[PDB]
């Protein structure tokens, strides 16, 4: 307990100490990014410990160190929840930071502010384990919007690129309206069972968990950018490819659902909620990997890749499966991060290209970056027992052995036809036939950072699923019984989507030229998604804030009806008053009036 | 800015140390008081009701 | 220790005793002798100093008791200074009962984490304890607004009162 | 209280002894001094508030609001003392007076036991509010701010006057403490229906209420620095602790006459927070934010529960500090460029670093980041609305979402993008302007650490 | 028109004095007031009365609360009374209407 | 006291002053001292008045 619990508290107080130091002037700046990297390193090492007590014998402890603040009767304290998810996701985030923190020193090297970019994914990385470890609602809220803004922060990290700013301020606005759903399931359990605790939502075990759970299904929505406040998570590619690499793997995209895996005790009674979700995993990834199908931008084949896979690990939950879709999360971010870093050396290598169309050959070229992506491909679609297998396969057919909606089910299989559909469609344009780049040959990935830092996400690729899946306890009866036809389903439509893809790239060598189609069109477009929502929303809104309530509102009407009408009269009554002709028998004359009404009308006299 | 935040620094610093410092001095060779029973027939005054020496002397002299 | 096992009770620790069914070295063994010699010792040490300083100043303070004065049940309306007592006491006690419901819900929370996975059956006293308790902070405290006072609780209580008699008299 | 008001009043001949070239330091460095002796008030206890005498206590409420006056007078100072350099010597010392004699009637206003003390403070700090914007404003519109700051003030306490002599006649005492003890229901009736808006309108029209808030924009704008330092921070929040003290005795009434300025507050925060995307003047902006997020504080003050009045409570600490920081800002580019349009001046981050990551901190604190207690004041009303009626979930919900952009759309429009070509004489942040900036937000800041001081008596 | 002083020009403190802290014109008036504000300021206010804020004796006695209430759920756990009563009022001092 | 600083004192001695008074004050509201239920005792051998 004494070592379980100090190792636990110094990764987290390691992590902010790069922090501490660059804010209180007792650096020395000149590799401060080999510090940050560091400590990350450390950090990592630290909390194996912990995560190895847990494997041994399932030892978890809740710290809650500091009393902050008693509202009359829910006290707040600074706690953390050392349990399964935190014991696992952690030396994961932190092996995938400590690669992709080396790899940011030889990719943001000629950057002039390098220093403020390892700073920014230090804090990115800090309010991710505070979101992770969090053992009440308020202290996971803190960061729940902290890896919101760090998020803002990186994406536009170009801040002179007006599309930088835009895709920015995209990403909170979609993530906000998620939060909406936060704040009401805060609410809700504050009001009905007087707590923000986790522990005690869980023991009071409410049944009627209707309102509080579509609050959190709308939050995951958001941040995990499912269906309907989806479009930010591709517009986030503004980013440089560290930011990209992080943002998809670890921190933000995962927290969403994160966030449902941490309440499977509630999710897990409500079949209300679990269809809910489960056709909101279903549409987002069948229709997230069809618009992977079309894109041309590396970085954005990839970022449409993540919402495809986080749609499949919100259907997971859809299945009440939270084990397999947390499991699909660390086995996630090892290939995931891995393809990134694996784009951004491609694309530094042909001086920021990005479109596929002007890769081409790069095979030969480069040789370890196609390892490196050939071995993330096959593991993003389920080679046996490469990283990727062991927790997509099983959610496959945990999924067609369920009692579940069929339209659901369908939908996703198509879906996984689709990832390797796309998956095929970057090794085919990046890597294979004849080089379509400019006439300057500059390839070179024979940096140590670069070969290191994919290394080891390489070994992790390959390994790292069948090590947590052997040393996960179980917490579930896995399904082992079924047909031959719904063991291997996903097996059989990955390779008849490989299959389909290579018949559908080599037919682009051909020399025919054939007119766009409908469907064509709608999947390199979004399915128009974007093109309308993002200009009919904010021309409705922004049109309304000027039109009505600014002007017609405040500058005129709420004038009107009161200081301009009431000024006004005054006016008119002042002329009428002080315009008289000054003349004495007019004066005279109306004082006759005055005693005459006072008598005959009023009585005065009486 | 390099000037300002090196002056906020020193600033901030000039009594942030002495106090940290004067406040470990405080922890380690005053320390606490410890809990009682109220003694028979005893009025505490009403910094007496106070554990840290600083919450103590803050109650005595001013409050 | 420091705390009442009373008020904050801990059910007796049932440890098992290592039993290996592996040739290979358990890392964790060694990796706790290392965390006593490098961590806990020299920390001990350094505590051990520090109390040797805290003995040569023993100093002591004080719980405050506060003598019970009559309730708002006992004041002569619009008498302030009798009004002002009561009202004083049953700000006390309000924020007592505070901290009473907190002491009950962190037994709830504590035992739910302790239980693990058979929490639903091992808690049930502490859960039964905890809506015993809310029901009557509910009664004695709900629905009086920012602006409570001993005189609203009153009307509070005289209303409920009411109702049990006539829900009596139906009887 | 004494112990604030003599030296409070000291500050008046210290100014005017002072050599010619020692004006500024002296009073700066003298009402720190005060500022620091003001945390003595923190004596609070669980049970009575502070009683000093017949004429002022301090409990929970006015302790934080009198410990957030005394700070900003120093900061008053430093931000004026720039545009106030080529001004004659004894109009100099006159404007230091005028702020030192605001302070002299806000921390009796937010300290006295008597009702009606509280109304002759409460209106007397028109007159010093009224000389800094007319006598030192820049523009024109200057003259009318002055007029419609005045005549909304002084329409809603007129009524307010009435009432509370008839409360006193009534019930023989306006005395806040008697009032505790001997407050009696007030029942369905047309002639209480007024009293309990000629005890509340005067509030609202310092707050501002929605749709009695056209004052605020004008006069937050024509002012002077240091008069929209003092207006946002402090003097809106005198409605804010006048309504949380006069509700007390406008019970159970309060239950169906909240509903129309509940209305107002929640859809009037929508509104004026959508007004905020769609402003060209920068200090004009955020004006209309100081409405938005006081809409917040009528709603729970109105609803009347424990968690609204802690959420109040905090919301009018972290606005002022917040509101404050961002005034101060805003003239930091208006001393460069002397315009207050919003687009003129962008790309300033390239061109001003540090004082772009003061922009980053004002903004998220502005739209609520946790565990700011901008946030923890917006928590707890929000949580304290829903109970009163779930569907407000969804007016807050979407407010948060449209105060996230503004308070963003404002940032990058001034400090990111490309810096405008024609504008070459950004100079570089003074000490004076940074330390101000750091005087606003490191305060703020470090009270998360210690929440539990701005949360009120409720706590 | 009239007979009017045109608008004076612009005045960057850095041109006379490039150690400007902005304060004032004077370099001696100026460091002056920069030392009042960052001592004052800085050095008292925020560092002293964050530590003030700090040691506090019991805000609002939130701690006493915490004691009290342990040493009423002792005494009412050991000898068998509820831990807390629906009636803040004792019923027979209480004399109900009708 | 010097030509130079002698203005330094105003505000300081405002403070002394106004503290200074607000003591005398709670010397006319002492129709309560030891004399509340809540607080009411005996005299310490030396004592004079319970709080001053
Ligand atoms: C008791 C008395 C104590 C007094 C108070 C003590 C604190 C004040 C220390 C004063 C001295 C500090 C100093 O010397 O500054 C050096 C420090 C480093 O020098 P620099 O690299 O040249 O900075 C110049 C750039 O402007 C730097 O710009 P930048 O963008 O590179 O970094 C500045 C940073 C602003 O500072 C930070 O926020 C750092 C991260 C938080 C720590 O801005 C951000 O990072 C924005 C994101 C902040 C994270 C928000 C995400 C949510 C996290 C919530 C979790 C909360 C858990 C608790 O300068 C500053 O950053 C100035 C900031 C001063 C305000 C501190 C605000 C803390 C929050
Ligand atoms: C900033 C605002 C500052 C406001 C003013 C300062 C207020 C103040 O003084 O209170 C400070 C407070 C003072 O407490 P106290 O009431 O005076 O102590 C009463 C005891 O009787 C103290 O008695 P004691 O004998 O136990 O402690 C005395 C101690 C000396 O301790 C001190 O006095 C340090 C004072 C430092 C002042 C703060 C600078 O003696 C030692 O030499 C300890 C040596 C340990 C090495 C072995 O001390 C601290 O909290 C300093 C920090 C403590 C270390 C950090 C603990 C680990 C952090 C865990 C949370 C992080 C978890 C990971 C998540 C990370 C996020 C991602
Ligand atoms: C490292 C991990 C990353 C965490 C982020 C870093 C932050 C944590 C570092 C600090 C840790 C130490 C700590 O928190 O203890 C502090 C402690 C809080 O923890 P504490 O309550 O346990 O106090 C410790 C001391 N004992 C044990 C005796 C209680 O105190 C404070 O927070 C100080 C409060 C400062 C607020 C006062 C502001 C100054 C007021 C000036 C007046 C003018 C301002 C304007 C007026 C506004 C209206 C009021
Ligand atoms: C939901 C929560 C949301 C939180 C939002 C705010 C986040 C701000 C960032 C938090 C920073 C980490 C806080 C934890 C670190 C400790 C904080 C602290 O001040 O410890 C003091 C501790 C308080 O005691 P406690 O009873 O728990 O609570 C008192 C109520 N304030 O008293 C002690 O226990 C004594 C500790 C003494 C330790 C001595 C060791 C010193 C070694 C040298 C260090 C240098
Ligand atoms: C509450 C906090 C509790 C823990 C307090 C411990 C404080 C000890 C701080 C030691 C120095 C920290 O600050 C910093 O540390 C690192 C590592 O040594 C140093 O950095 C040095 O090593 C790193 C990597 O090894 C290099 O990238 C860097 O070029 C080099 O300068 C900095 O020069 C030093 O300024
Ligand atoms: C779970 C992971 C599963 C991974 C599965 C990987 C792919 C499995 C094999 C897919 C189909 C193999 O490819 C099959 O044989 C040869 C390639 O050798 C192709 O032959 C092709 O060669 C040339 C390329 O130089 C094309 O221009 C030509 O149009 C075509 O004839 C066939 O068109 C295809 O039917
Ligand atoms: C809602 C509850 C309280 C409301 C009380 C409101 C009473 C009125 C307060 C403001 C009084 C200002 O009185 C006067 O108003 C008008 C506009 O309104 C201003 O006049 C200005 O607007 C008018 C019409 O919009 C123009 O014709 C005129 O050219 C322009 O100068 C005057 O400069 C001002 O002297
Ligand atoms: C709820 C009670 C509210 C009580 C509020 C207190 C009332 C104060 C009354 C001030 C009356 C004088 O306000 C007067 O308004 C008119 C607005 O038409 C202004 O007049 C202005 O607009 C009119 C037409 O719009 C023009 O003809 C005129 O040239 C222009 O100056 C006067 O310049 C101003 O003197
Ligand atoms: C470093 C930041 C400082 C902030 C400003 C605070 C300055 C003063 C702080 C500490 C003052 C001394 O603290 C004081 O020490 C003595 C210990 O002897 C305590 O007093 C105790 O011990 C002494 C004997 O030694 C006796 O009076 C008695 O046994 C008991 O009262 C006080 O209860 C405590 O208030
Ligand atoms: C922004 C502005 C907000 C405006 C808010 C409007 C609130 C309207 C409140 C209406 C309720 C007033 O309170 C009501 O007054 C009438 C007085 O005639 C009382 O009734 C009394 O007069 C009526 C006659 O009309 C009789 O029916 C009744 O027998 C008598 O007792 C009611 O017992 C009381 O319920
Ligand atoms: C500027 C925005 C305008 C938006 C429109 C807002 C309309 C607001 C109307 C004000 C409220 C009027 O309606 C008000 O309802 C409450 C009940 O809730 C009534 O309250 C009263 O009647 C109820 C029963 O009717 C009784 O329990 C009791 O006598 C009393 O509570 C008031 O007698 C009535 O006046
Ligand atoms: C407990 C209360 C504490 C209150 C503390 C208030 C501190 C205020 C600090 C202001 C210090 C200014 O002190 C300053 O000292 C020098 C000599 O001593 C004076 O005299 C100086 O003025 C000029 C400046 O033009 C100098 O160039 C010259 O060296 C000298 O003649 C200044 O006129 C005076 O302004």
Not at chain 3, 115 to 130: D, W
Not at chain 4, 197 to 222: I, S
Not at chain 4, 356 to 363: E, I, M, V
């Amino acid at each position: 307990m004494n070592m379980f619990s100090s190792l636990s508290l110094v990764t987290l107080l390691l992590l902010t100490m790069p922090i501490m130091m660059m804010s209180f002037n007792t650096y020395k700046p000149s590799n401060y990014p080999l510090y940050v990297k560091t400590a990350i390193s450390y950090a990592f090492i630290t909390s194996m410990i912990p995560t190895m007590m847990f494997i041994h014998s399932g030892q978890e402890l809740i710290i809650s160190n500091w009393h902050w603040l008693t509202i009359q009767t829910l006290k707040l304290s600074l706690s953390f929840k050392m349990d399964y998810f935190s014991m696992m996701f952690i030396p994961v985030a932190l092996f995938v930071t400590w690669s992709i923190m080396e790899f940011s020193m030889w990719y943001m090297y000629s950057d002039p502010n390098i220093n403020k970019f390892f700073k920014y994914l230090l804090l990115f990385l800090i309010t991710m384990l505070i979101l992770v470890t969090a053992n009440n609602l308020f202290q996971l809220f803190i960061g729940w919007e902290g890896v919101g803004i760090m998020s803002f922060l990186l994406i536009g990290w170009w801040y002179g690129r007006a599309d930088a700013n835009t895709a920015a301020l995209q990403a909170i606005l979609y993530n906000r309206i998620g939060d909406i759903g936060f704040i009401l399931a805060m609410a809700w359990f504050l009001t009905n069972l007087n707590t923000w605790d986790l522990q005690q939502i869980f023991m009071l075990n409410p049944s009627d968990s209707n309102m509080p759970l579509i609050g959190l299904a709308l939050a995951a929505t958001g941040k995990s950018a499912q269906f309907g406040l989806h479009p930010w998570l591709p517009s986030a590619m503004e980013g440089p490819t560290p930011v990209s690499a992080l943002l998809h793997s670890s921190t933000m995209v995962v927290a969403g659902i994160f966030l449902l895996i941490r309440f499977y005790p509630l999710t897990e009674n409500n079949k209300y909620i679990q269809s809910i979700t489960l056709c909101l995993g279903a549409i987002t990834t069948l229709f997230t990997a069809m618009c992977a199908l079309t894109q041309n931008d590396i970085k954005k084949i990839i970022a449409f890749s993540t919402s495809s896979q986080l749609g499949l690990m919100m259907v997971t939950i859809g299945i009440n499966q939270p084990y397999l879709a947390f499991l699909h999360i660390c086995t996630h971010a090892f290939f995931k991060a891995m393809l990134f870093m694996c784009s951004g050396s491609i694309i530094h290598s042909l001086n920021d290209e990005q479109d596929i169309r002007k890769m081409g050959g790069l095979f030969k070229a480069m040789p370890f970056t196609t390892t490196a992506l050939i071995v993330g491909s096959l593991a993003l679609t389920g080679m046996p027992f490469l990283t990727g297998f062991y927790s997509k396969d099983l959610i496959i057919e945990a999924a067609n052995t369920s009692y579940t909606n069929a339209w659901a089910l369908l939908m996703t299989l198509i879906a996984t036809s689709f990832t390797a559909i796309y998956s095929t469609r970057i090794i085919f344009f990046a890597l294979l036939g004849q080089p379509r780049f400019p006439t300057l040959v500059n390839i070179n990935e024979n940096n140590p950072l670069l070969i290191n830092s994919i290394k080891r996400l390489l070994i992790g690729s390959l390994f790292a699923g069948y090590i947590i899946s052997n040393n996960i306890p179980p917490t579930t009866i896995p399904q082992m019984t079924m047909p031959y036809y719904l063991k291997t389903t996903a097996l059989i439509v990955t390779i008849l989507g490989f299959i389909l893809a290579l018949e559908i790239s080599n037919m682009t060598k051909n020399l025919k030229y054939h007119y766009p189609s409908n469907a064509f069109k709608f999947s390199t477009l979004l399915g128009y998604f974007p093109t309308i929502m993002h200009r009919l929303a904010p021309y409705m809104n922004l049109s309304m804030s000027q039109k009505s309530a600014s002007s017609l509102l405040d500058l005129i009407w709420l004038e009107a009806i009161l200081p301009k009408t009431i000024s006004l009269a005054q006016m008119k009554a002042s002329t009428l008053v002080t315009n008289q002709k000054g003349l004495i028998k007019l004066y005279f004359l109306s004082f006759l009036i005055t005693i005459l009404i006072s008598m005959i009308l009023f009585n005065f006299h009486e | 800015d390099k000037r300002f935040l090196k002056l906020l620094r020193f600033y901030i610093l000039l009594t942030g140390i002495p106090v940290a410092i004067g406040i470990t001095l405080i922890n380690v060779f005053i320390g606490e008081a410890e809990l009682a029973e109220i003694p028979e027939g005893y009025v505490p005054e009403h910094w007496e009701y106070f554990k840290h020496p600083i919450s103590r002397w803050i109650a005595r002299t001013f409050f | 220790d420091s705390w009442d096992k009373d008020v904050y009770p801990e059910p007796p620790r049932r440890t098992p005793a290592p039993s290996p069914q592996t040739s290979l070295p358990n890392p964790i063994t060694y990796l706790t002798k290392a965390f006593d010699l490098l961590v806990d010792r020299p920390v001990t040490l350094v505590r051990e100093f520090i109390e040797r300083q805290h003995a040569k100043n023993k100093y002591y303070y004080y719980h405050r008791e506060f003598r019970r004065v009559p309730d708002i049940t006992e004041c002569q309306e619009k008498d302030v200074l009798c009004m002002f007592e009561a009202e004083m006491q049953w700000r006390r006690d309000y924020k007592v009962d505070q901290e009473i419901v907190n002491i009950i819900q962190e037994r709830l929370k504590a035992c739910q984490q302790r239980e693990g996975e058979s929490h639903r059956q091992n808690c049930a006293k502490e859960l039964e304890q905890f809506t015993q308790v809310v029901k009557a902070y509910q009664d004695r405290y709900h629905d009086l607004g920012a602006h409570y006072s001993a005189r609203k609780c009153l009307a509070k209580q005289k209303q409920r009162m009411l109702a049990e008699r006539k829900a009596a008299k139906e009887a | 209280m004494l112990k604030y008001i003599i030296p409070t009043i000291m500050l008046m001949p210290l100014t005017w002894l002072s050599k010619n070239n020692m004006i500024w330091v002296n009073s700066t460095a003298h009402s720190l001094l005060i500022s620091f002796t003001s945390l003595l008030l923190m004596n609070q206890f669980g049970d009575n508030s502070l009683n000093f005498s017949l004429l002022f206590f301090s409990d929970s409420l006015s302790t934080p609001l009198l410990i957030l006056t005394m700070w900003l007078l120093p900061l008053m100072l430093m931000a004026s003392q720039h545009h106030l350099s080529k001004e004659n010597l004894t109009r100099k010392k006159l404007f230091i007076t005028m702020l030192i004699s605001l302070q002299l009637f806000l921390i009796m206003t937010f300290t006295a036991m008597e009702l009606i003390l509280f109304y002759i403070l409460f209106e007397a700090t028109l007159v010093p509010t009224l000389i800094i914007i007319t006598r030192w404003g820049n523009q024109t519109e200057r003259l009318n701010a002055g007029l419609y700051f005045l005549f909304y003030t002084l329409a809603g306490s007129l009524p307010l006057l009435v009432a509370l002599i008839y409360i006193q006649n009534t019930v023989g005492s306006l005395n806040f403490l008697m009032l505790q003890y001997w407050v009696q229901p007030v029942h369905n009736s047309w002639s209480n229906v007024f009293m309990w808006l000629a005890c509340m309108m005067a509030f609202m029209v310092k707050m501002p209420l929605y749709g009695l808030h056209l004052w605020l924009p004008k006069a937050h704008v024509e002012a002077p620095i240091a008069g929209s330092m003092v207006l946002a921070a402090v003097l809106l929040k005198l409605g804010g602790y006048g309504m949380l003290r006069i509700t007390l005795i406008l019970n159970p009434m309060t239950d169906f006459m909240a509903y129309p300025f509940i209305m107002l507050s929640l859809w009037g925060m929508i509104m004026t927070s959508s007004i905020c995307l769609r402003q060209t003047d920068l200090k004009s902006l955020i004006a209309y934010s100081s409405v938005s997020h006081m809409a917040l504080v009528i709603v729970a003050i109105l609803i009347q529960t424990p968690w609204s009045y802690m959420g109040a409570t905090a919301l009018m600490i972290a606005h002022g500090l917040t509101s404050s920081m961002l005034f101060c800002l805003a003239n930091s580019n208006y001393e460069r460029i002397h315009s207050r349009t919003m687009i003129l001046a962008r790309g300033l981050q390239t061109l001003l670093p540090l004082m772009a990551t003061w922009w980053l901190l004002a903004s998220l604190t502005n739209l609520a980041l946790p565990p700011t207690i901008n946030l923890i004041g917006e928590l707890f009303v929000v949580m304290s609305t829903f109970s009163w009626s779930n569907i407000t979930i969804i007016l807050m919900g979407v407010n948060m979402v449209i105060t996230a952009l503004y308070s963003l759309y404002m940032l990058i429009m001034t400090q990111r993008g490309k810096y405008t070509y024609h504008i070459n004489n950004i100079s570089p942040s003074f000490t004076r302007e940074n330390a101000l900036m750091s005087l606003h937000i490191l305060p703020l800041l470090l009270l998360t650490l210690n929440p539990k001081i701005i949360l009120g008596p409720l706590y | 028109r009239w007979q009017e002083d045109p608008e004076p020009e612009d005045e960057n403190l850095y041109e006379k004095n490039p150690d400007s802290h902005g304060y004032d014109k004077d370099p001696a008036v100026d460091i002056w007031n920069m030392r009042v504000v960052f001592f004052f300021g800085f050095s008292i206010v925020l560092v002293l009365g964050s530590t003030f804020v700090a040691y506090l004796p019991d805000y609002r006695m939130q701690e006493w609360a915490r004691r009290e209430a342990e040493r009423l759920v002792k005494y009412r756990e050991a000898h068998g009374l509820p831990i807390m009563e629906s009636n803040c009022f004792d019923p027979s001092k209480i004399q109900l209407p009708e | 006291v010097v030509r130079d600083h002698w203005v330094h004192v105003l505000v300081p001695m405002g403070f002394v002053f106004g503290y200074y008074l607000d003591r005398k004050n709670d010397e006319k509201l002492t129709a309560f001292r030891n004399k509340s239920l809540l607080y009411k005792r005996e005299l310490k051998p030396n004592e004079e008045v319970t709080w001053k």
